[PDB]
Structure 1
Amino acid sequence: PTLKHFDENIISLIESEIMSVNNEIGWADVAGLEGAKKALREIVVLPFKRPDVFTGIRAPPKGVLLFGPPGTGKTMIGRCVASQCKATFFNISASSLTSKWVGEGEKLVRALFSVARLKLPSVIFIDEIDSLLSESSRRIKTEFLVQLDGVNTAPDERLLVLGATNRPQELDEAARRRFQKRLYIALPEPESRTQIVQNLLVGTRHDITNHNLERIRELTDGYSGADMRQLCTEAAMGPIRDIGDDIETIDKDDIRAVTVMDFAEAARVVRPTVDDSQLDAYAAWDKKFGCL
């Protein structure tokens, strides 16, 4: 707290639950997405590392839009991107703005860009940004565009706004225009899905074999990484449900290992959250608006 003065509660709200700083966390736990990984590195990381090189025609975009089905790790992708540029991270939802924090919001959208503005390099992550760019809602939704044109008005500032959306087909020309680059973050590849599962099972007693991984991969077509997590929780319930009344007395170590059937059954309960008709409406939007 210094050099600036809004309600001193706004500032705290930022230090407390927007402002974040994570060092040297690479891509860790973000599975797959090689395409997008490459691009973010080219368009944001490299530029933040060498602003002496990336000027003139080699300037980075000030606005990148990540879009795709929900539960594809978009918010963490942002956290890693920030971590590799050794940048101050600012995570914030547009719903937290247009509901949890209204009236106060417009004053906060301002203070956000001010803080960011002096923690350079800074990365501002706005989740569900399509709501923000579509009432006190309008008062805020305006201050926002104000704030974000300013970003396109300071030349040598290492300040990127990173916006994420599950509903890109919901952004008009003037909206999409604020985004030089537009990255499609899509559902886990088959091999990605099983890496997730392996992360999620660490610390849980299980007999999952590589041959099993393959069966799981086989019946988790269309699953997001969030579904995969749902899957694992449900699968882990198998042992739990085999008990009954010993439950309150049983040794946790005596709990049956998680097995492939656990997943096979789990899969029957936990189904993909994305309708095939949507994956197309994404691919269509992407090939006509995305940096493919």
Structure 2
Amino acid sequence: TAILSEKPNVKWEDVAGLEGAKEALKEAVILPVKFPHLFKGNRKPTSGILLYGPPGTGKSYLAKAVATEANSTFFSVSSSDLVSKWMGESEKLVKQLFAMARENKPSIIFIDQVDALTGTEASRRIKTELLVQMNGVGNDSQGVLVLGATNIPWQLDSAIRRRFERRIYIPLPDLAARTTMFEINVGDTPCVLTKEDYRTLGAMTEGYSGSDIAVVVKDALMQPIRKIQSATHFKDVSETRKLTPCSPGDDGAIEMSWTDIEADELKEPDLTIKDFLKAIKSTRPTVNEDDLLKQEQFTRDFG
């Protein structure tokens, strides 16, 4: 299981925002696949694409969407794992990976953290084997497309860099995308959030990543459970008896614990925007603001 394989089922719409990358990938990858007769002779589809941008944008998830939409098998590998965990057998692994992908066209190879192939003799082999394999466009043949992912494109070996004809920036999510991420992350959970609240949550998380948003949302959803747990005082409201947590000393405030209260006849506190706003304060964004420039320096130079 050093090499993952799957026929993923991620539609474009399942990936929050990124419409620009998406549209780049559509014409870079999907057009060739949709209309292969366009690529007779010396006109050949891209076969290396680098995805670069700050962490927490789900470059992986987007990659699966491409596979789903190209109707191809998704083969994938982590370069950090290759360099550290497997080491000795890494040459063999990079081989087998390209070999599986050839045997399974149409297919996509995903190499995560391509920077981690180069430096801190032994992994010099991995670099070298990868390069030979990406010359496997000039095997015959393909078929197979390599999508590299990096957070630190400026630390990516220029030789490897050069094998990735096409480069696409995966930005931090904008207002609309963050709004979508909040919705997706709560999905079906019982709550009383409006369309406007989602937008508010969106607007209020400038500079957050999908990951960041995921952690904030995971935090917020637990709040009603959190309230039920640490009360101390409940109260009847309203189909026969129904009690919810309330402050010490209130209109009908009995003193008890959740344990004291009967099956069902609990009234969980509503899940409010206020729970999410709280969660936003206690989870700072992950990604430094100087990254914009560092990534944009790369878009300017090797875009």
TM more than 0.5: yes
Counterpart CA distance in 2 for 1:124 and 1:85 is 13
Residue from 284, 287, 291 that aligns with 1:271: 284
Q: TM-score if structure 1 supplies the norm length?
A: 0.87
Deviation at 1:68, TM superposition (A): 0.3
Contact between 1:133 and 1:175, CA under 8 Å: does it hold in 2?
Answer: no
Which of 16, 25, 29 is matched with 1:40 structurally?
A: 25
**Higher mean C-alpha deviation, range 211-220 or range 36-45:** 211-220
Kindly report which structure 2 residues correspond to 1:1-292, keeping only aligned pairs within 5 A, or say none: 13=1, 18-22=4-8, 25-56=10-41, 58-134=43-119, 136-149=122-135, 151-244=136-229, 246=257, 254-290=267-303
Spell out, residue by residue over 1:61-110, the C-alpha distance to the aligned partner (whole angstroms, 9 max, x if none).
21100000111121011111111111111021101211222212211111
- The one-letter code of the counterpart of 1:262 is D
For residues 164 and 51 of structure 1, what CA distance do their matches in structure 2 show? 26
1:224 to 1:57, Cα distance in 2 relative to 1, 3 A: farther
Give the drift of 1:249: 7.7
Deviations 1:2-60 (A, max 9, x none): xxxxxxxxxxx36xx5111135x421320111111111111111112333212445312
- Give, in whole Å, the separation in 2 of the partners of 1:136 and 1:49: 41
Cα distance in structure 1, aligned partners of 2:40 and 2:297: 33
Aligned residues: 274
Preserved CA contact (<8 Å) 1:212 1:260: yes
- Secondary structure at the counterpart of residue 163 of structure 2: coil
Query: Aligned with 2:37: secondary structure?
Result: coil
Asked if the contact 1:205/1:256 (under 8 Å) is kept, the reply is no
Inter-partner Cα distance in structure 2 for 1:249 and 1:44: 60
Higher deviation after alignment, 232-241 or 266-275 = 232-241
Is the CA contact (8 Å cut-off) linking 2:127 and 2:160 kept in structure 1?
Answer: no
Give structure 2 stretches of 5+ with no counterpart. 231-256
Deviations along 1:182-213, whole A, 9 cap, x unmatched? 00000111011111111111232211112212
Give identity over the alignment, percent: 44
Task: Report the 3-state secondary structure (helix = DSSP H, G, I; strand = E; otherwise coil) of the residue aligned with 1:91.
Answer: strand
Write the distance in 2 (CA, Å) between the matches of 1:60 and 1:152.
10
User: Which blocks of at least 5 consecutive residues in structure 1 are unaligned?
Assistant: 1-12
Instruction: Report if aligned partners of 1:89, 1:124 keep a CA contact under 8 Å in 2.
Output: yes
Larger Rg: 2
1:240 to partner: Cα distance: 2.3
Aligned-partner Cα distance in 1 for 2:85–2:267? 44
AA of the residue aligned to 1:272:
P
Alpha-carbon RMSD across the aligned residues, in angstroms, is: 2.1
- Give, as a single letter, the amino acid of the residue that structure 2 aligns with 1:106: E
- Choose between structure 1 and 2: higher strand proportion: 2
> What TM-score do you get using the length of structure 2 for normalisation?
0.84
> Aligned in 2, Cα 1:86/1:248: closer, same or farther, shift over 3 Å?
farther
Letter matched to residue 146 of structure 1: V
